[PDB]
């Protein structure tokens, strides 16, 4: 169901990548792989990813401006019951990564490792 070395979980296939990229570069990277940055929209996926990696990795969450809503790459706003997992940030930290079970806003132009998602 998944390309070689992509991990089969729930609906989807997950790829992990240790290239130090900005959020936008990471978005493009996933797009180049016919995939998207991760949507961490429930407790199950939090635990799956947490069990698998301890390194900071970008996810597909960003906001247009510090006073606008956080959205996933699919256009959806972050779910109510996932706010527990989102730490607060400063202004002009408009992109988020996942680290050891929580999501953290940071500078979009900082570089981090990443992971991508596509359908099986």
């Amino acid at each position: 169901p998944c390309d070689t070395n992509w991990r089969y979980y729930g609906d989807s296939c997950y790829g992990f990548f240790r290239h130090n990229l900005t959020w936008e570069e990471s978005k493009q990277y996933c797009t180049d792989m016919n995939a998207t940055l991760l949507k961490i929209d429930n407790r199950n996926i939090v635990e799956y990813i947490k069990a698998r990696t301890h390194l900071i990795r970008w996810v597909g969450l960003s906001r247009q401006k510090s006073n606008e809503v956080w959205k996933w790459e699919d256009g959806s706003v972050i779910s109510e019951n996932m706010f527990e997992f989102l730490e607060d940030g400063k202004g002009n930290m408009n992109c988020a990564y996942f680290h050891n079970g929580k999501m953290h806003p940071t500078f979009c132009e900082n570089k981090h490792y990443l992971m991508c998602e596509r359908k099986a």
């Binding site: 992990f16 069990a51 698998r52 990696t53 301890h54 390194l55 992971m115």
Partner: peptide, 10 residues
Amino acid sequence: AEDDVVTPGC
């Protein structure tokens, strides 16, 4: 699993 993957040179 994902973090310590050591890959051979080509």
